Amino acid sequence: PKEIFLVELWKKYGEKAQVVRVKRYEDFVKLKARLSGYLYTIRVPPDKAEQLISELKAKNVKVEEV
Amino acid sequence: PFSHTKIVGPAGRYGARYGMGIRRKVTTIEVKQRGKHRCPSCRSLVRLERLAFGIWHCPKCGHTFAGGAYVPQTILGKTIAPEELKGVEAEKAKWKEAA
Amino acid sequence: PLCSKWESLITWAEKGGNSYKALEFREKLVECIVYTATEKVKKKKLDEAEELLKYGKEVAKKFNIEELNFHIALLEKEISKIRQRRAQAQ
Amino acid sequence: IDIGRELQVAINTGKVIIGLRETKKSLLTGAPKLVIIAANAPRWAREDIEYYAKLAGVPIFTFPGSSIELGAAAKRPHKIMALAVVDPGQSEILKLVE
Amino acid sequence: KVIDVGRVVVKVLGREAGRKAVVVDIVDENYVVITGPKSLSGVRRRRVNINHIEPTDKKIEIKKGASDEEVLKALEAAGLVEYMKERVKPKLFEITPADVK
Amino acid sequence: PRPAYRSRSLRRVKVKTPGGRTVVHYEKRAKGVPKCAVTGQPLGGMNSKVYRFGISTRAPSRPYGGVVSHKVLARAIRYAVRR
Amino acid sequence: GKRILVQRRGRGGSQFRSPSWKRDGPVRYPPNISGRGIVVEILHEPGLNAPVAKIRMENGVEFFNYAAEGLYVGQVIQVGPDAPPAVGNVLPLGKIPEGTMVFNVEKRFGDGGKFARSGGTYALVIGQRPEENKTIVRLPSGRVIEVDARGRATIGIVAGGGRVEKPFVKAGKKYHRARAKSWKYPTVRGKAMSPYAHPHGGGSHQKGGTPVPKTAPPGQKVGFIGSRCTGRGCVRARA
RNA sequence: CGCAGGUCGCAGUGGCAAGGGGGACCUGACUGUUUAACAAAAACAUAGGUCCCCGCGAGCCCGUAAGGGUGUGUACGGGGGC
RNA sequence: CCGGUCCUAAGGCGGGGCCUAAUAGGCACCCGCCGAAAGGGAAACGGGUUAAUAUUCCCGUGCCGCGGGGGUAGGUUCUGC
Ligand SMILES: [Mg+2]
Ligand SMILES: [Mg+2]
Ligand SMILES: [Mg+2]
Ligand SMILES: [Mg+2]
Ligand SMILES: [Mg+2]
Ligand SMILES: [Mg+2]
Ligand SMILES: [Mg+2]
Ligand SMILES: [Mg+2]
Ligand SMILES: [Mg+2]
Ligand SMILES: [Mg+2]
Ligand SMILES: [Mg+2]
Ligand SMILES: [Mg+2]
Ligand SMILES: [Mg+2]
Ligand SMILES: [Mg+2]
Ligand SMILES: [Mg+2]
Ligand SMILES: [Mg+2]
Ligand SMILES: [Zn+2]
C-alpha cells in the first residue's frame, strides 16, 4: 500500500481504480484507490473529499464506504 | 620506571609464572615492541601498529612496510634499507659536499 | 533546511520541462516535511516539529501546495493539545 | 649559507607560504620565486610540485632534511613538507637557487 | 602563474572528469572559468575550482573572457582540436593507498 | 530450519502483532557495501543497506563510477596527464 | 599395535599434514617475470616463517614473494638482468655483485626459489664463475654451494627476523602456532612408552638409546641416526 | 551514597545463600592430560635447555608398484633423541 | 515466497591413463560429478478456520524470478541533465 499527499497525483490512480474506498473521520477523509497492484490512500479535507467523490462517480468509478 | 611496577613492566600480565629469566626476556623485547619508534618514511615519533610479525603500519602517513618480528627495524635490516627512503641522507651528504 | 534537496529538484525538473517529474518531486517534498514533522510531534519533540512546520509554511507559499497547508494545520492542532496537557499538568 | 637562519628572516621580513596545499596554489595562481621541498616528501607530492614548478618556471631546492627538520629550521613546531618563497625580505634565501 | 587564460586543462573530478578544457577567465584565487567547448570535448562553460583541474603543458593565445567560437578558432590555429577530443585514461592498477592517504 | 535459527546467521527480531502475540522474526543481515578497489573503504553513493542480491545500485556520475573513490580517480588522471 | 610414531607419519594422516588451504598460494617465482612491478600488498600467511609480498607486474601478472626487510607497499621493484641491485629487486644471480645479501635463491633457473626463505635469513653472494654459468653463494647454515647463474634471487634479507628470540612462554602459544603448521603437538618421549611402542620404552629405570647405524631399518632408526659424535665434544670437533 | 535522632530481639549477611585459619617438610615449577568400568598421581605434557640427521634431486617416513607424507615448505626450516 | 532443491568446504566417487598375475586393489595426472535440512544463498506477512494441517486452506495486504502488452523518460550521423 502507498500514500499520496497531492490530489492531482492521486487522481491519476483514482481514475483507474477497481474501487475507491472511503473512510470518514471528523477532520479528514481517507480515500483508497484499489488498483490491481497497489492500494493508494490520500487524506483530504472533508469538503475536498465530497468534490473528489463526485468526480469519480461521474467517471463511473465504483465508490464504497468502509 | 613503569606505570605501576618497578621492573616487570609489560610482563606484569604473567604474574609470578614462568620464571624471572623468561619474563625478563619478554620485557626486554616488548619495551621496544610497544614503545614509540620513528616511521621510516615520515620520520614521525609515533607508536607504529604491528599488523603481524614483520608487518608494520604508520598511522600518520599510512606507510606499510616489512620489518622485524617485534621491532620495526632489525640491526642488520637497518644497513640494507631501500634507498628510496634514505633520501634525507643523500641530500645531507650532498649539502656537506657542496657548500 | 531538511527538505532542501526536494526544492532544488523541483526547480531543476521544471526548468527542463519534465512536468511528470516535477509533480513527483513536489510529492516527495510534502512527504519529507509531513512525515518528519509528524514523527517529531509523535515523539513530542515539539520544538523540532515547529521549525519544520515554519519551513513547511514557506515552501507551501513558494510552490502553491494547498495540501501542505492542510496537513500543517492538523499537526499544529495536535501540538497545541500536547502543550495544553503539559501546562495543566505543570 | 645557513638555510635556517635565512628562512626565518624571509618569514619575518618578506612573505613565505608554508604548507603543501598553499604552495601548490601559489605555483598555480601566484608567482613564487623559490619553492623548497623536504627530502622525505611523498612521491605523489614531489611529482606534483616538480610538475607545477616546471610549468611555472620556478626553481626547486630540496632541503637536506626531513619535513620535521624543515619545520624546525623555520622555527615552527610542526612539519613542513614544502614552502614557497614569494618575497625574500632581508635574507639571501635566493642564494639556494644556484 | 600556470592556470591562466588559454591554458589547456583536464578536469579531474565530477561528471566531466577526464575531459579536456580551456581556461578562459579568472574569478578569484580559488576559481577560474573553463569552457572546453561542449560540442568539442563535453565540458560546459562554468566556473571550476582550481583544485579540480590539472594543467597541461599546452597553452593557446586567446583574450580574457573569450567566447566558445573564439576558443574553437584558436584550437584549430594551434592544431589541438583532435587533442581536445581525446579523454585522459587513468591507470588504476598503478595506484596504491600510499598515493591517496 | 530450527538449527538454522540456532546459528547467528539471521537476526532474531522480536515483534508484537496486531493480534497481541509477541513473535520472533528471523531476518537476513545486510550485505556488505561496495568498497574501493585501492583503499578498501566504502564508496560514497553506494553504501546504503541492502539485504538481498539482485538489486540494482546506482553508481555516482563519474568515470569509473562505483569502482574507485574520487580520490583514486583524480590522482590517476593527474598521473596520466603528465605521462 | 607396534609401529612407532615416526613410521605412522609417513602414511600422511590428517594429524601429520600441512593445512596448506589456509594460505593464499605458494611463495615462488613465476618462470617469465620481467620489467617493473609494484608491491601492492604485504600479508601474514598462516604457517609461514616470514611476511609475504604480493607483487603486480606491468602486464598484470601477480606473484607472491617473501618481503625483503624494508620493503613497503607501493614500492616499485625491478625484475630481470637490467634491474639494479636494490632491495626488493629480483635479479639473475650472475648479475648480482659479490658480497651482496640475497634471499629466496633459486638452485636452478625456474625452480621458484629454494634457499634462504625463513624470516631473518639471507644468503651471501661469494663469487662468480661465469665460464660455466655458476654463482657461488653462502647459505644461512654456512654451507657454500654453486647455483645456476641464470637463477633468480631477491636483494636484501627476509623480513620478520628475531621471531624465535622471544620465548613461546606457554604451551598454549605453541599449540596455536602448531595448528597453522604441520607439526604433531605435543611430543611424547620414547622412554615414556612401553617397549611395544618405542625402542627406548620399557625398563624399571627407563633410558635413552645409543646411536643406530645409517643402515638401520625404519622403526629402528630413531634416537641418534649415524651421528658423527654427540655432546659437547662433537661441537668442539665440529669447530 | 551519607548524616542526626528514636527503638526491639537470645539472635539483624536473622530464612535462603554463604571461605575455618596458621607454621613446616617432601614432591611436581605453573595452567593442562591420563588407566570409559577398583589407580588422577610424584605418572604424561609443558615453556625453556641441549645434542644429532639434513642445502632440498636433502634428511626421515609410507607404498607391491604407479607414486606419496613432511612440502602451497627451505636452516629464525623439516625430522630424530634426552 | 517455510526447508530440500542451487554453491562450494574438509573430503569423496566415476571415466581416461599409469600401476597390478588379476580384480570388486592403488591414485600423483586429465576430465566430470558428488559433498552442508546449523556455512553461502531469490521472494510473505497479519488475522480467521479444523476433531486432527497452517507463513501451506480462507480473507486482506504484498514480494521474487522469468516473459509479454500499453504509457513515459529517452533514442532515431553523434552524444542524458
Ligand atoms: Mg543455511
Ligand atoms: Mg552470514
Ligand atoms: Mg596439525
Ligand atoms: Mg608407562
Ligand atoms: Mg622393540
Ligand atoms: Mg636396538
Ligand atoms: Mg631401555
Ligand atoms: Mg544453607
Ligand atoms: Mg603438576
Ligand atoms: Mg579407572
Ligand atoms: Mg578414580
Ligand atoms: Mg615428567
Ligand atoms: Mg632449567
Ligand atoms: Mg644422556
Ligand atoms: Mg551438491
Ligand atoms: Mg497440531
Ligand atoms: Zn609515517
Side-chain angles (χ1 to χ4, degrees):
Chain A
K2 296 188 196 187
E3 183 183 15
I4 302 203
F5 281 95
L6 306 180
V7 173
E8 145 170 49
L9 186 49
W10 179 88
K11 273 167 65 203
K12 325 256 208 73
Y13 306 100
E15 286 164 273
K16 295 182 298 203
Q18 319 159 332
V19 61
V20 165
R21 311 168 176 159
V22 186
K23 190 91 210 299
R24 297 181 188 274
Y25 288 92
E26 49 282 316
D27 282 333
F28 65 96
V29 176
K30 282 185 178 179
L31 302 180
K32 306 148 179 239
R34 169 79 259 174
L35 277 72
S36 169
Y38 291 105
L39 180 75
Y40 289 96
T41 296
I42 181 150
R43 281 126 84 221
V44 295
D47 59 279
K48 176 53 74 147
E50 289 320 299
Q51 166 198 129
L52 274 193
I53 281 175
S54 303
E55 306 197 336
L56 294 148
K57 265 176 233 261
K59 282 207 180 13
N60 279 336
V61 178
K62 182 189 190 252
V63 171
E64 100 164 303
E65 307 254 329
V66 296
Chain B
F2 293 108
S3 166
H4 303 98
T5 55
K6 295 151 307 193
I7 65 194
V8 302
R13 80 195 180 251
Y14 292 135
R17 301 183 293 282
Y18 315 114
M20 160 172 97
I22 300 285
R23 281 184 289 105
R24 172 137 74 211
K25 304 166 151 290
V26 173
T27 291
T28 303
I29 288 156
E30 301 208 326
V31 161
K32 295 134 73 43
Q33 174 181 353
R34 289 180 217 293
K36 271 141 175 306
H37 327 84
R38 236 97 194 181
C39 171
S41 201
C42 69
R43 305 295 189 74
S44 325
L45 189 287
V46 64
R47 208 233 164 161
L48 297 168
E49 172 196 0
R50 199 184 57 136
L51 296 173
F53 84 93
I55 307 177
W56 300 83
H57 178 77
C58 174
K60 298 261 166 274
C61 71
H63 200 241
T64 311
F65 61 101
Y70 310 111
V71 292
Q73 279 186 78
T74 65
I75 300 332
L76 171 60
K78 279 189 188 173
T79 80
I80 194 163
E83 296 299 339
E84 217 65 55
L85 299 128
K86 305 298 281 193
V88 172
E89 320 297 339
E91 299 287 336
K92 260 173 189 171
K94 186 189 332 173
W95 173 256
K96 150 240 290 185
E97 196 233 2
Chain C
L2 174 74
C3 310
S4 266
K5 92 166 260 195
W6 304 115
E7 283 198 291
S8 294
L9 285 166
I10 291 167
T11 326
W12 170 80
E14 264 161 20
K15 197 222 208 143
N18 204 341
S19 271
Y20 159 87
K21 256 302 165 180
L23 186 46
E24 296 231 289
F25 290 152
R26 202 167 288 242
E27 164 79 6
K28 296 253 180 243
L29 167 65
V30 175
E31 277 162 19
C32 176
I33 288 171
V34 173
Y35 284 157
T36 321
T38 304
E39 176 222 330
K40 294 309 158 157
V41 172
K42 257 68 176 57
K43 304 282 117 170
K44 307 196 197 297
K45 306 276 116 150
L46 313 181
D47 284 342
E48 300 181 34
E50 288 198 5
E51 325 319 337
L52 272 156
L53 293 184
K54 166 198 142 271
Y55 165 92
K57 286 190 270 254
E58 313 184 289
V59 318
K61 175 88 46 82
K62 206 189 173 219
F63 292 103
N64 216 296
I65 284 156
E66 148 197 274
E67 298 91 333
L68 200 41
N69 296 328
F70 164 66
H71 282 288
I72 283 174
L74 292 174
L75 291 172
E76 278 171 4
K77 180 171 87 233
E78 187 50 79
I79 282 174
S80 70
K81 281 184 63 222
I82 287 160
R83 270 185 209 300
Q84 201 141 314
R85 284 183 214 116
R86 286 232 207 91
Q88 162 258 12
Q90 265 118 228
Chain D
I1 155 181
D2 183 12
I3 322 190
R5 207 193 335 184
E6 305 257 77
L7 198 48
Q8 306 199 18
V9 167
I11 286 152
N12 299 339
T13 62
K15 199 203 175 52
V16 168
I17 290 177
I18 288 169
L20 178 56
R21 270 170 56 130
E22 295 260 82
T23 299
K24 276 172 135 183
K25 211 182 55 43
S26 100
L27 280 164
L28 291 165
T29 58
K33 316 231 82 63
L34 173 86
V35 164
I36 298 175
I37 191 161
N40 68 334
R43 191 170 72 46
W44 62 269
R46 162 155 46 65
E47 286 182 37
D48 273 50
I49 291 296
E50 262 160 24
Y51 183 59
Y52 291 155
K54 161 216 280 283
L55 302 177
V58 188
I60 295 173
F61 177 70
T62 287
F63 183 73
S66 71
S67 60
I68 294 171
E69 265 160 341
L70 179 52
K75 253 206 172 263
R76 306 240 76 201
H78 55 81
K79 310 189 220 196
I80 296 175
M81 193 170 320
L83 54 58
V85 152
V86 200
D87 188 14
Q90 294 170 4
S91 92
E92 53 221 4
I93 207 88
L94 298 185
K95 261 191 216 173
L96 309 163
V97 164
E98 319 298 332
Chain E
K1 84 209 316 284
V2 171
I3 296 306
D4 197 35
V5 173
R7 161 79 63 199
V8 172
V9 299
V10 175
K11 199 163 181 153
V12 298
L13 287 178
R15 182 159 60 85
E16 280 154 344
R19 300 177 182 284
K20 261 114 176 176
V22 166
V23 181
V24 298
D25 195 358
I26 276 73
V27 170
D28 52 53
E29 67 273 29
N30 304 311
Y31 298 104
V32 292
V33 180
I34 61 142
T35 165
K38 200 193 189 293
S39 69
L40 172 59
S41 73
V43 173
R44 68 221 201 249
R45 179 185 255 251
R46 45 200 276 253
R47 77 196 189 112
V48 74
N49 196 314
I50 57 130
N51 297 320
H52 306 149
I53 46 170
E54 171 88 344
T56 294
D57 71 5
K58 270 102 189 52
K59 189 152 200 146
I60 73 165
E61 308 139 52
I62 44 145
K63 50 155 269 291
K64 182 144 216 93
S67 89
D68 283 332
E69 82 281 343
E70 307 197 308
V71 162
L72 220 42
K73 75 207 262 195
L75 295 158
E76 51 196 308
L80 298 175
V81 169
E82 304 291 324
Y83 181 75
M84 297 282 297
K85 286 206 277 76
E86 265 78 79
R87 300 190 325 291
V88 177
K89 259 193 67 119
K91 289 219 285 228
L92 303 173
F93 274 125
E94 287 179 2
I95 304 272
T96 36
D99 314 11
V100 289
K101 170 64 190 307
Chain F
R2 188 44 163 155
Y5 300 158
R6 300 178 209 169
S7 82
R8 309 312 288 245
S9 313
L10 303 165
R11 323 195 288 123
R12 296 182 202 162
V13 182
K14 260 158 298 203
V15 64
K16 209 171 159 143
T17 71
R21 336 180 283 125
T22 319
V23 300
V24 172
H25 279 175
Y26 299 100
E27 310 209 305
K28 289 209 300 186
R29 316 207 167 239
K31 320 286 188 196
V33 302
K35 314 269 189 325
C36 177
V38 170
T39 73
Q41 297 309 333
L43 297 170
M46 326 177 84
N47 47 341
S48 276
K49 252 52 199 314
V50 153
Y51 290 90
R52 77 176 176 87
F53 295 136
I55 282 161
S56 158
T57 298
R58 186 153 63 186
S61 320
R62 209 178 22 246
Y64 285 97
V67 182
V68 295
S69 60
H70 74 280
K71 252 185 234 201
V72 170
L73 181 67
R75 162 74 22 200
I77 288 178
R78 281 187 214 272
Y79 281 163
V81 158
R82 305 171 193 155
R83 200 174 278 92
Chain G
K2 226 185 154 147
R3 291 212 183 180
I4 70 179
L5 192 274
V6 74
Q7 290 182 285
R8 301 202 280 102
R9 176 191 310 282
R11 296 176 87 262
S14 184
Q15 80 274 36
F16 296 109
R17 293 198 271 108
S18 173
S20 289
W21 51 84
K22 295 185 174 182
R23 304 169 199 150
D24 288 318
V27 186
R28 309 261 173 177
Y29 301 124
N32 296 312
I33 35 164
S34 212
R36 64 169 251 158
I38 302 177
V39 179
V40 296
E41 256 188 323
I42 299 168
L43 321 154
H44 173 271
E45 287 298 311
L48 292 198
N49 311 288
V52 171
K54 173 129 85 73
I55 289 120
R56 200 201 146 81
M57 313 296 305
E58 278 256 2
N59 63 49
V61 152
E62 305 167 346
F63 69 103
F64 292 119
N65 193 24
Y66 286 119
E69 168 144 4
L71 196 91
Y72 53 92
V73 171
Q75 169 178 354
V76 175
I77 76 158
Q78 302 271 349
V79 182
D82 327 70
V87 166
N89 282 333
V90 179
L91 274 72
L93 276 146
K95 291 285 186 290
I96 300 177
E98 271 142 289
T100 310
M101 284 175 326
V102 293
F103 70 92
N104 200 14
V105 183
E106 288 194 319
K107 166 89 165 140
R108 301 179 283 188
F109 165 82
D111 64 38
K114 298 243 166 229
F115 307 120
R117 289 159 57 96
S118 210
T121 70
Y122 65 85
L124 212 67
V125 173
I126 285 326
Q128 302 272 7
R129 284 193 335 111
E131 64 286 4
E132 63 223 79
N133 286 43
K134 296 291 209 23
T135 303
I136 287 78
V137 289
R138 207 216 318 283
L139 300 182
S141 74
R143 171 88 18 98
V144 172
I145 66 159
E146 295 190 286
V147 291
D148 180 7
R150 305 161 274 230
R152 280 150 318 179
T154 316
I155 307 285
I157 70 164
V158 190
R163 150 176 63 79
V164 307
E165 95 206 299
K166 205 181 193 164
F168 263 133
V169 181
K170 339 183 275 189
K173 212 54 143 181
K174 189 163 174 178
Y175 165 98
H176 293 301
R177 177 75 165 153
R179 284 194 79 183
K181 289 244 171 194
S182 66
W183 319 329
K184 167 130 175 69
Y185 182 86
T187 322
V188 183
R189 296 166 294 120
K191 67 152 62 176
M193 309 167 160
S194 284
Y196 81 102
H198 202 272
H200 296 182
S204 182
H205 289 303
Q206 315 100 294
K207 295 163 185 77
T210 64
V212 306
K214 265 296 177 166
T215 58
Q220 202 193 87
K221 199 144 58 144
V222 285
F224 295 97
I225 298 172
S227 52
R228 214 185 38 171
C229 31
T230 54
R232 290 169 296 180
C234 203
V235 177
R236 166 161 73 259
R238 256 177 234 284

